[PDB]
Design a protein around this ligand. Sequence first.
Ligand code: A1H5A
Length: 138
Amino acid sequence: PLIVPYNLPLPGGVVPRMLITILGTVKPNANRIALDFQRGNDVAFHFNPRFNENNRRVIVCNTKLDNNWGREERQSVFPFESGKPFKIQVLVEPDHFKVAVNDAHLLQYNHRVKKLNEISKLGISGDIDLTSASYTMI
Ligand SMILES: CO[C@@H]1[C@@H](n2cc(-c3cc(F)c(F)c(F)c3)nn2)[C@@H](O)[C@@H](CO)O[C@@H]1Cc1cn(C(C)(C)C)nn1
């Protein structure tokens, strides 16, 4: 296991066709999970499952620039379940990040931060047991 929060370096940033895989288990009474693809202090891509926002489950995505959150992108399709093993795959494409959970496509997020080769860290936080975090080129 990996301690959470966890920082995965992404040496030399990200590039199209880079696939980042996060494996773990959702805690039984989970409230929130977050992935933060960072360019220094900026968050190029924040991926944030919320298990109980107003008695809904929702996926919130956003970007943080100079410590300011931008416009949220929200999804009600919610593939996570408390207590279960999960896989999140984030595939970097030329114009977006593409996210699949448990081998099912979830969402796309267009690039707001354009210096892909400076997005050099992935933070992983929240209500998970983290098993692995890695990357490969497809
Ligand atoms: C409440 O703060 C949220 C942000 N957040 C979550 C975590 C977080 C931290 C952990 F350690 C976790 F384990 C974990 F799962 C999530 N950190 N920051 C982030 O989600 C932001 C996305 O827009 O929305 C919130 C902040 C926000 C939003 N807005 C608008 C755009 C509506 C005006 N202004 N401020």
